[PDB]
Amino acid sequence: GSQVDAEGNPFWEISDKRRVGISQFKKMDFINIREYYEAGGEMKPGKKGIGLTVDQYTAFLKAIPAINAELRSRGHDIT
Amino acid sequence: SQVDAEGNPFWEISDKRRVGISQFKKMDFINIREYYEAMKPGKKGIGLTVDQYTAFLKAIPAINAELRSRGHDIT
Amino acid sequence: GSQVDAEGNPFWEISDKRRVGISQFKKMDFINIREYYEAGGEMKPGKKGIGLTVDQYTAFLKAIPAINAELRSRGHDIT
Amino acid sequence: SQVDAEGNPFWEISDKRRVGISQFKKMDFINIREYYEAGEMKPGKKGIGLTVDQYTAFLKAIPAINAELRSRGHDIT
Amino acid sequence: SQVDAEGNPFWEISDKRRVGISQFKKMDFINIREYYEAGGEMKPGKKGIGLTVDQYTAFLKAIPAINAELRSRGHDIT
Amino acid sequence: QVDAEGNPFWEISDKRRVGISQFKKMDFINIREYYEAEMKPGKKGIGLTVDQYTAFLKAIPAINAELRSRGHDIT
DNA sequence: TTTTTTTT
DNA sequence: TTTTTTTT
DNA sequence: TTTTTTT
């Protein structure tokens, strides 16, 4: 479910140490997919990851049906 | 719908950026990564497991919702 | 018996590819039963497995006598 | 000690986690697995299936792991 | 005299049993093992034994005795 | 050397024997690990049928060849 | 300069 | 949305 | 004290 950090930036966990988040930066929005490390009971973002510009994420959303199909063909249950 | 040098399929999301599926040791990963010209993979990027990629997928409608409310159009 | 992984964590082999290990996360102890894969030297933990809270583990331990009894009535020897 | 739909026995280790024995390809398995609800209770992705040899190797390690857990402050009978 | 998927030599002795040489932790092992089919590719199974080079050589020393006893029980050995 | 059953055996290590036995009318050539109490046979090990053992014997020169070229010393 | 741990 | 398998 | 988001 949709959580929020200190800055009020929304994130969703996709692992125990991996998130997707929306942050703002130099007037633009960025969708980040990144590993988090633990630092003093809190979670900071780490070097392993990628920040998507809004358009790069929408190009991504369009390749999803093709990705989904190929996965199934390899025996995965994609709902 | 392209196919790379290894034989894995990809989809360009930028001049330098790709989404792909690769198999490393019988195991499947969904990679989102920057590429530089040799076209080799670089520092920025992430290798998602299937479980991780499906968790992502379930979060997508809400992400789009929050993206929308910040003024972006997603279909 | 108690071998130590790269990061100081105790593990016990139960197979050439499966292990039980103790490790910390969010400052709490987790008992992991997980299969490992080889990679450029060391065995690293894999995606196939389950990680137990300590109470989950002690609940398992409470179930062991009855499990042993049921395996024996299927002709397995259990020391 | 309870019985599932497949008639197998299980012991609950938490609200959505189970340990149980099953037969499959005339072999016995120790299963430690997450379950989810569906009109009723189905096994999930997270989990492992132990061959009895693997399970007996486990049993052998228990006193050692138990000692470790006590040295970290856990109460383990 | 054929080579497996990993790249090691082996010899069949049954329908599902191989003798093979593999390297592990810098030492050579001679495995006498049962294999199963899986992904159309025979993989090593639970049943078998891995010999260190010293155990295999000790084993070769015991062969003429083994052969003798088998012959007296009526088996032919070349 | 003879074990408790009456079978002959040959030590190939401090805990490992080669022995011949006779179960259910056939002859087995056993390569097995044994353990203390009065030694008794362990799970780890393999019992060959005479045929498999003869197939084994044919390989031996080829195996010795392989090991020798890995610098091992075999008479 | 790619690619597999950790609950409620 | 299950269920395995070398190497002293 | 001990590396580490954002084209």
Total beta strand runs of chain A:
5
Distance between the termini of chain A: 17 Å
User: What would you report as the Rg of chain A, rounded to the nearest angstrom?
Assistant: 15 Å
Oligomer: homohexamer
Q: Which class of chain A in CATH terms? A: Mainly Beta
CATH architecture label of chain A: Roll
Number of domains of chain A: 1
Task: Describe the structure in your own words.
The structure is a homohexamer. Chain A is α+β, with helices and mostly antiparallel strands and 79 residues long. Chain A has a 5-stranded antiparallel β-sheet with strand order 1-2-3-4-5. In chain A, strand 1 and strand 2 form a beta hairpin. Chain A is globular, with a radius of gyration of 15 Å. The first copy, chain A, has one domain: Transcriptional Co-activator pc4, Chain A (Roll), CATH 2.30.31.10. Chain A starts with a strand and ends in a 6-residue tail after the last helix. Chains C and D meet through strand 2, strand 3, strand 4, strand 5 and helix 1 of C and strand 2, strand 3, strand 4, strand 5 and helix 1 of D. The structure holds 3 DNA strands. Chain F: It is found in: Nucleus.
Describe what is shown at a glance:
Chain A is α+β, with helices and mostly antiparallel strands and 79 residues long.
Task: Draw up the topology in text.
The structure is a homohexamer.
Chain A: E1 3-4, E2 10-13, E3 18-25, E4 28-38, E5 43-53, H1 54-73
Antiparallel strand pairs in A: 1-2, 2-3, 3-4, 4-5
Chain A binds three DNA strands through residues 16-17, 21, 23-26, 28-32, 34-37, 39, 44-53, 55-56, 77, 79.
Family (chain F): Belongs to the transcriptional coactivator PC4 family.
Subcellular location (chain F): Nucleus
Protein name (chain F): Transcriptional coactivator p15 (PC4) C-terminal domain-containing protein
